[PDB]
Design a protein around this ligand. Structure first.
Ligand SMILES: CC(=C(c1ccc(O)cc1)c1ccc(O)cc1)c1ccc2ccccc2c1
Ligand SMILES: CC(=C(c1ccc(O)cc1)c1ccc(O)cc1)c1ccc2ccccc2c1
Lengths: 10, 235, 221, 10
């Protein structure tokens, strides 16, 4: 869940 | 609603500029090598590749127009497929070998001592061989790869559908520009997509091996694997 | 050969003619295994009646069938389930919904995907003439310029011919063609997960797969 | 031999 969400927001 | 307006030419350009780089492994050419952790190098490679893929996908026309969850779902289902089509793409010029990295070239005999490698290896070669004989072009490559991203997701995703049609029209444009007759454009379009099914096949083989079990998978690589857990596999 | 000798219309008739029948079922996996086993016998003779499949050597026929058998079984199920939203028509007497998928591992996950695929065909208004073309492709594309590719081109030309007949424009033809072939990837996926669970509950000694299913299964593993 | 092998023959 988390990690992919964070990497999709730059 | 901006990808739906892009002409075929400026569609290829957007995808071409979205292209992630080719990475290198942590392999050392000066010292002897051991196939006791090819999977370690591959894992480290795949992990670093994923980050570049994530941002590449965000530069795929129409992808951002989706919600996070949709973007997440597509990435979770297609990450190994996309890795395997890029790998196969750059392995065309090296028959009988897989070019994981410009410093990490792999022959069939490395396919040994590591379980599942041989089967997946021979599948990757055949796909590369097929692409090689089909004379796959770089403009076509980025098109097919973006389709995998948007199609691997097994109030209507009709947005994705309109984008899929877009990429399709783009491929026909390339073949027509290449000088293919209408029949050849259809046949070639068909063949390229038929090979995508094999890419689906290989990814699924890679998956069940990967989450069977060093191997020091990353935090992120564990996520992309567990998405293929209980949403599909078999305890 | 033969396949490369047929016109588009003659190719369609041969495939519609080659069509295997809809069977009836005779614990959930037991009924599905029994049905599948009986279906596989029809599929083999169906394959032999697919233009250009017999041109191949016996060795290549075994490979392609060992590779596509579950895919072909699934596209059949999905096809005949179209008139039943939210339910799967394995047989005219065995119409299961998503919920019948529980108790047994992986079935509800696979059911969802099969249902999803069925809705996709439903929205696309898939036709029987198109359906038999796709089934033939799956057979020829399961493995692994040449013969098989030349036939796949003939079937593609046939699909295009069907669409043009339906009144579709050139642009609508390559989009729909693409749309159809993309769904085949989902079919490959569902089939992969199907065999994966199949082999697992085979190891777990749960479902008694028939001899024919045991052989097909080991052709992958 | 294999059941699939035999059926394809006849
Ligand atoms: C081929 C492959 C991996 C890979 C795919 C694309 C790429 O650019 C680089 C490597 C791979 C993916 C994830 C990993 O954690 C490790 C390698 C791959 C995938 C699964 C395998 C399973 C068993 C044996 C070999 C495998 C190779
Ligand atoms: C859906 C399915 C099977 C099936 C496919 C087509 C058809 O016309 C009838 C049944 C099936 C195939 C072989 C079997 O031995 C049993 C069922 C299927 C496939 C794999 C599955 C794996 C886990 C749970 C359910 C499954 C159902």
């Amino acid at each position: 869940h988390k990690i992919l969400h964070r990497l999709l927001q730059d | 609603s901006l990808a739906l307006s892009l002409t075929a030419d400026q569609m290829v350009s957007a995808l071409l500029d979205a292209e992630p780089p080719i990475l290198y492994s942590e392999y050392d050419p000066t010292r002897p090598f051991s196939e006791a952790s090819m999977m370690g190098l591959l894992t480290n490679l795949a992990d670093r590749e994923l980050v570049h893929m994530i941002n590449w996908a965000k530069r795929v026309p129409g992808f951002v127009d989706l919600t996070l969850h949709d973007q997440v779902h597509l990435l979770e289902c297609a990450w190994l497929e996309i890795l395997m089509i890029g790998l196969v793409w750059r392995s065309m010029e090296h028959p009988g070998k897989l070019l994981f990295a410009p410093n990490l070239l792999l022959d069939r005999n490395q396919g040994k001592c590591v379980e599942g490698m041989v089967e997946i290896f021979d599948m990757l070669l055949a796909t590369s061989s097929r692409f090689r004989m089909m004379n796959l072009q770089g403009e076509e490559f980025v098109c097919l790869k973006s389709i995998i991203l948007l199609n691997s997701g097994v109030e209507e995703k009709d947005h994705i559908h309109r984008v899929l049609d877009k990429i399709t029209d783009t491929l026909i444009h390339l073949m027509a520009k290449a000088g293919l007759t209408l029949q050849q454009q259809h046949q070639r379009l068909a063949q390229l997509l038929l090979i995508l099914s094999h890419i689906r096949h290989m990814s699924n083989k890679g998956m069940e091996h990967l989450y069977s079990m060093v191997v020091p998978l990353s935090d992120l690589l564990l996520e992309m694997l567990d998405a293929h857990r209980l949403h599909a596999p078999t305890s």
